[PDB]
């Protein structure tokens, strides 16, 4: 006959393995969902069977019970609502019981085990980054070990480890100037300062920091244009090629100047065209 890999919703056999075989020969391997099919058909039929019958008809599961169903650590066999063996997630809980916790995915888990559970079930990369509710600012976020606090464009804290070893340059072209007016030896150094501070500083322009009065004194590399901030007295090089494609999926913004812009993209057209820096203020519209 034919032996199979799994049982689709239909209760059908998909994923064919062997040919001209017997039930038991197939049902020998202790694989949870492996099933057996009875009839020997022309392969074409098998095919049509997947257009028509959405799989292969008359699917005999090789496991109606849970014996020697090996799920692996963390997964156990929980008999069903219809009685089919389904390996559910069962990590080790009492070994690390402790208050709510913060996952590396930004979501808050009731406790650690609730997190581990969630790891096994759908995400292999989840871990606790810091204790307690995941918060927005780095204020009272006690990061563990050597990890440091840091936040992103949308202001989410994350405990992270900062590289503090950077090579001396051996070039004056690797030099960078930051929005903070500081001259950095490498992009390595700049990052190191970004991490240690816990907030984005931003690149102003490549080269040494020169003391500019207006965008006149600034040399932009990379087809970037100069945008100036008269409130802070500094310059910056930016890409100004974005297009701002139509969409009413446009969540307009209120810029540094308090002018409702159609979209962040449109905020930047503006700034670029006018040579004046526009960052985002609030969310919404400018009332």
């Amino acid at each position: 006959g034919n032996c199979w890999l799994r049982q689709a919703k239909n209760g059908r056999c998909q994923v064919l393995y062997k040919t001209e075989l017997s039930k038991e020969e197939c049902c020998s391997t202790g694989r949870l969902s492996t099933s057996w099919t009875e009839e020997d058909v022309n392969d074409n039929t098998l095919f049509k069977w997947m257009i028509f019958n959405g799989g292969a008809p008359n699917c005999i599961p090789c496991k109606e019970t849970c014996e020697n169903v090996d799920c692996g650590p963390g997964k156990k066999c929980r008999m069903n609502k219809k009685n089919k063996p389904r390996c559910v997630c069962a990590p080790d809980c009492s070994n690390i019981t402790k208050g709510p916790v913060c996952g590396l995915d930004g979501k808050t888990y009731r406790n650690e085990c609730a997190l581990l559970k969630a790891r096994c079930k759908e995400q292999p990369e989840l871990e606790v980054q810091y204790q307690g509710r995941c918060k927005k600012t780095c204020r009272d976020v006690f990061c563990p070990g050597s990890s440091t606090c840091v936040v992103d464009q949308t202001n989410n804290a994350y405990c992270v480890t900062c590289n503090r070893i950077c090579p001396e340059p051996a070039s004056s072209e690797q030099y960078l100037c930051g929005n903070d007016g500081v001259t950095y030896s490498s992009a390595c150094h700049l990052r190191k300062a970004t991490c240690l501070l816990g907030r984005s500083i931003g690149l102003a322009y490549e080269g040494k920091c020169i003391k500019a009065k207006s965008c006149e004194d600034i040399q932009c590399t990379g087809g970037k244009k100069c945008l100036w901030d008269f409130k802070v007295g500094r310059g910056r090089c930016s890409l100004c090629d974005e297009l701002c494609p139509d969409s009413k999926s446009d969540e307009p913004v209120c810029a540094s100047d308090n002018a409702t812009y159609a979209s962040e993209c449109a905020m930047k057209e503006a700034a670029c065209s006018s040579g004046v820096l526009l960052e985002v203020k609030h969310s919404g519209s400018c009332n």
Partner: protein, 116 residues
Amino acid sequence: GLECDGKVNICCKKQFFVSFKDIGWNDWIIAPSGYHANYCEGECPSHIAGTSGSSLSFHSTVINHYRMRGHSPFANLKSCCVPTKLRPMSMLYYDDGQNIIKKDIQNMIVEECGCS
């Protein structure tokens, strides 16, 4: 739906954990440190593709009828085992202005393999 069990030796989903160090990406990628990307490897018979259940099954079958009947274009076509379903993963990296950014990068993880 074929996760690579242990010598089934078919087009299957293998496991691999990428270390951003190894790639030289430890640099601009802040977190995580690595991930389970996995890869696709195995072989592509004529009886596994149509039965595979993947999004490629139908199409790979049509082409295959042609490959059997020896049509030149396809006579030299291969029928590789590639990812057919990929899922997104979040990353925290430095962008180009060196700003700390958190974004969902799509299809970073191989979820389902198939023949095609």
